[PDB]
């Protein structure tokens, strides 16, 4: 896992990409309903993607669940922002569900606006697909790593492993930038620009989690046990 | 500001550092908690405004954008300051030199949750052996980055403002790399450490959101600094 080359890391991540799902509605002849149904179906595929992120299945089941519990909304969001990049002023939730900010005003527009701004920022930077899949894996590995409130020997080893995998993704990002002919200065500047966007994505997830919690619906935040069930796969 | 050398940037940030304040209580009296922390935070905010104006490039911005940046970043900046001065006190948070608290003392006034996250950040700083020069760079990055994706304006002036902010952020990136090269780190180690440092900022954003949630939940008129209060201090 930690022996992969930069190109091999990229190929692994590109091959692991989840599919783009459609919204489920009768196109012949409810907004939050549609988004929730979409998000729920994406989550199943996200679990498959996560297990194919180099290093992720080396972790205990418990730590895998903790990471996904922390990162799942950030991952949905960065995927949406990536899909939306070439659609200025709109969010491509699905190919049959492309919404502008006005259509967010039915429940939400605050969140829509933050996502739209991220998409624009990605457009301004000319974010590449290879960079995107690196950033998405970084979110998965990083978002929950500081909240392992455990200091068992096992936990120390798990955190050390995660930071080693995060280092390899850093090396990989730098490599893609060197491959594109960027100077050393441009490389570290772009690395920093990309990573700083992750704090905003964290911010957006927190705002969105605040909404889901306020709905006071039993199933709207994925339980540890539900995440456990999807992750704890038999063979 | 964009013409400062790396060493000049560091010197300017080091000289701009705010003082360490004390908690205001009669130490001869029996040992409220939120009251002490709030009084401390309020007095720190005044010095924070002073610090911000000495961050190279910050006063080049419009008053309105300065307020926006501080509105977005002020709790993150208090938190990173806390985590930094707690670095050499494992298991404790050094709110002030006369107010060193462990997690059991956080349980008095949903605070232990926030205490635990702060403690974990301090431990992460400790393990990375974070340096003072690095810390002031990171704090400046928070000030400039946290609000830059939420200006929600695309006037010519706002385009110029965002461009300037990203140029200053780039210079701070250059500065961090130079500090690491000065310390003898290889190019690989430099990029990996830059990444490790910046990824911690997502967790600090997370912590600020959790804390803002508490302050808002108090329903007290002045506990979240208003736009116009920040404007008066920034005049
Ligand atoms: O590609 C995507 C599909 C749907 C979404 C997003 C990306 C980005 C955030 C969205 C959002 C809008 C308003 C409030 C909060 C978030 C929305 C979305 C809606 C609902 C969600 O949660 C539904 C609950 N559901 C239960 C288990 C997991 C999710 C997640 C995301
Ligand atoms: O060095 C510092 C002084 C005080 C603090 C911190 C750092 C870190 C977060 C703290 C916290 C504890 C519980 C909940 C939220 C945050 C607490 C703190 C307490 C109160 C605060 O807000 C008071 C309101 N006040 C009104 C204008 C500005 C702040 C901010 C930070």
Swiss-Prot record, chain A:
It is found in: Nucleus; Golgi apparatus; Cell membrane. Widely expressed. Not expressed in the pituitary gland. Changing residue 224 to A: Reduces PELP1-mediated activation of transcriptional activity. Phosphorylated by cyclin A/CDK2 and CK1. Phosphorylation probably enhances transcriptional activity. Self-association induces phosphorylation. Phosphorylated by LMTK3 in vitro. A lipid is attached at residue 134 (S-palmitoyl cysteine). 17beta-estradiol binds at residues 42, 83, 211. Nuclear hormone receptor. The steroid hormones and their receptors are involved in the regulation of eukaryotic gene expression and affect cellular proliferation and differentiation in target tissues. Ligand-dependent nuclear transactivation involves either direct homodimer binding to a palindromic estrogen response element (ERE) sequence or association with other DNA-binding transcription factors, such as AP-1/c-Jun, c-Fos, ATF-2, Sp1 and Sp3, to mediate ERE-independent signaling. This is Estrogen receptor. It comes from Homo sapiens. The chain holds residues 307 to 548 of 595 of the full protein.
């Amino acid at each position: 896992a930690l022996s992969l080359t930069a190109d091999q890391m990229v190929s692994a991540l590109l091959d692991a990409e989840p599919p783009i799902l459609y919204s489920e509605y009768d196109p012949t002849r409810s907004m939050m309903g549609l988004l929730t149904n979409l998000a729920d179906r994406e989550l199943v595929h996200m679990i498959n993607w996560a297990k194919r992120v180099p290093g992720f299945v080396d972790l205990t089941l418990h730590d895998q669940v903790h990471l996904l519990e922390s990162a799942w909304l950030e991952i949905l969001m960065i995927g949406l922002v990536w899909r939306s990049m070439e659609h200025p002023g709109k969010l491509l939730f699905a190919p049959n569900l492309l919404l502008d900010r006005n259509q967010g005003k039915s429940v939400m527009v605050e969140i829509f606006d933050m996502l739209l701004a991220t998409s624009s920022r990605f457009r301004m930077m000319n974010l590449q697909g290879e960079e995107f899949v690196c950033l998405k894996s970084i979110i998965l590995l990083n978002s929950g790593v500081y909240t392992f409130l455990s200091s068992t020997l096992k936990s120390l080893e798990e955190k050390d492993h995660i930071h080693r995998v995060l280092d390899k993704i850093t090396d990989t990002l730098i490599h893609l930038m060197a491959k594109a002919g960027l100077t050393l200065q441009q490389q570290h500047q772009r690395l920093a620009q990309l990573l700083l966007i992750l704090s905003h994505i964290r911010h957006m997830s927190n705002k969105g989690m605040e909404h889901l919690y306020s709905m006071k619906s039993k199933n709207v935040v994925p339980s540890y046990d539900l995440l456990l069930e999807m992750l704890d796969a038999h063979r």
